[model samples]
Target: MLYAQVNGINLHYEIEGQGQPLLLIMGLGAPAAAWDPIFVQTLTKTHQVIIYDNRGTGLSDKPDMPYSIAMFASDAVGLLDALNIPRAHVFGVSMGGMIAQELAIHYPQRVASLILGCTTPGGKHAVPAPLTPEEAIREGWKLSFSEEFIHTHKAELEAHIPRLLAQLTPRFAYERHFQATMTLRVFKQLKEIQAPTLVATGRDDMLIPAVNSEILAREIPGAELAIFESAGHGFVTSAREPFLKVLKEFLARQSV
Candidate 1:
């Protein structure tokens, strides 16, 4: 329940575990609480994980204005600065991955490594998801996880949905966040990333599509790619075990 004033607004953030610092930036319109608690707890085993609500989500101040990927990236950098973390490994999902790209590109000195999941390079090169905001919200669960996952783990995943919706992003804030995502155009600049990188995604993702991860791996020299077969956008939860295995392995290699 800690708050940091960064980039002209207050951001709600939490730090867990004890070891190498890892900052996790979440996807569009989702609060920090949207992260599965058990998954986060597991990450705590080998790294100090920082989880925070983006400006327009959760307990953070929601100013009704246009947002941009660079602005989101700056907020992430400011959070690290406020906590005296000069450099850290960054993991981002969906829209958060876009912001991580900007952070690694513009402030290379602030990041040691990067893990991008279920996201895209944006602009004309991106294969846009076929859903509007209303449609997306309406079928979020169906669109985010595989049919088998939902059939088997619907209750489990549903139990946590309320926690995520507790501080739901207002319609205005969601629109602003949606607008920010449109401004993302980092395809040509992917080569600028110098951090050790891993690009991952769920093969069955309907939201961002796994091919985006392929593009990311190809664009970022030496980047590794992992696809969770049969999983979807919410693979972080549905494919939790495999996701953590790959995540921990990548971080282990980067750790000194």
Candidate 2:
């Protein structure tokens, strides 16, 4: 475990392997631990892996309020500065992807390449369509439970539940996390990013949907898009093998 003071908060991070730096930023309500150790080890075999807990998650300092994508992006930038890395291949999932977008937009020089997974652009243009009230509540609970809940709610949970639970037990903080997520307008700056990017999603991802990934890939000039079949929102875990394969190939092409 490593801690760095950034923006008056103590951010926790972990590093592995020894090649070009590859920073992994996790999604909403998930800490650094959400990145599976096995997957990290595999990536580390070829690249330096840097995984960190965003503010208010994992071992990082959790202030009472003031959570936004821009702020989170700054936290990541600060982590790079503290590590003395001028730039790195940045990989982010879900909310983390949003932060990566913000990082690429606001701190372009610090991003060598970008990989966005299972995420959506935010704001009026990217707001997810409304869900049934029951679905809203179920999803709220789904993001915060352990595997036991998956087994119990198997029929109700999305297809990716089992894989998601296997990675990290969930915690019931979605409401608060959502509030924090709404405070920022990160997606509007996507067009300004010049870094080579890979946008990936699951074909059946009902949470953000594959169309969202298409939007990102279409908007970002020359950005590549990879859609996984029979996968859902947690496709990163459900389709780990193929996802990693694509990721490795993408990074190799970019010399990351």
Candidate 3:
């Protein structure tokens, strides 16, 4: 457990393993602890994995104010500087991926490789992810996995949703977070992401469809796209094996 006073807020973060730095930014209102253990524990074996709760989640300070992509992106940089990491491989999911996009654009020298999952480049041409109505929402228990995984592993997924929601910072905090991702207009600047980038998505994602990843692959020069067939927003779990394999290969191929 570590807290750094970054951008006027106490940012919660953790460091694991001992190798090249790899920063993992979480999504939406999720906490850093929600990062899948398979990714965290496994990747840490070969890299220095950094995980943290965004300002409004987990143990991080949740300030009630207007939030922008720039602020969140700055917070990310602050963490790196605080830890003396000159550069790192960045992995972000959902809203975290959006933040990574901003970081790669504005702080290019600080990033070695970029990995985005179930995220989009917000702008006029971006396809907004579908949000469940507040009334219909069941905290974090909503369907995020593929059809096959959901039905076959109903008990398993159901058990994990509550665990996921348990670490949420605050429901209100999500408003600012969501707004930050939506209001960002970084589509035109994506071409500037010089680091190796891999855009991965679930083909069956009902919320953030695969088309967004398609757009990411097409717009970002040399960006690679990996689609998990029959998987949804929870592709991270349904396709963990292939995802990690692809990621490990990408990270290894990085010209360090």
Task: Provide the clashing-pair count of each candidate structure.
Answer: 0, 1, 1
TM-score order, best first, reads 1, 3, 2
**Top TM-score hit:** 1
The positional error of residue 63 in candidate 1, measured at the CA in angstroms, is 0.9
lDDT by residue (1-256, candidate 1, tens digit) is 7999996799999998999999999988888998889999999999999999999899999998899998999899999999999999999999999999988889899999999989999988778887654444437788887667778886786677568657889889989999999888788889988999999899999888788899889999899999998888888987899999999999989962
Each model's lDDT: 0.89, 0.78, 0.84
Measured over all alpha carbons after superposition, the RMSD of each candidate to the real structure, in angstroms, is: 2.4, 5.5, 2.7
Range of the 10 consecutive residues with the lowest summed lDDT in candidate 1: 130-139
Stretches of model 2 off by over 4 angstroms after superposition? 127-176, 186-188
Weakest lDDT window of 10 consecutive positions for candidate 2:
166-175
What digit string (tens of lDDT, one per residue) describes model 3 on residues 1-256?
6998886799999899988999999888778877777768999989999999898888899998878878888999999999988999999998889989999999999999999999988676777666543323333334575455656876765555555555666768988787777656788888878999999988988888679999998989899999987777878888888999999999999843
TM-score of 3: 0.91
- Each candidate structure's TM-score, on Cα atoms with residue i matched to residue i, is 0.95, 0.82, 0.91
Higher-TM-score candidate of 2 and 3: 3
Kindly indicate the candidate among 2 and 3 with the higher lDDT: 3
Find the candidate with the highest lDDT and give its number: 1
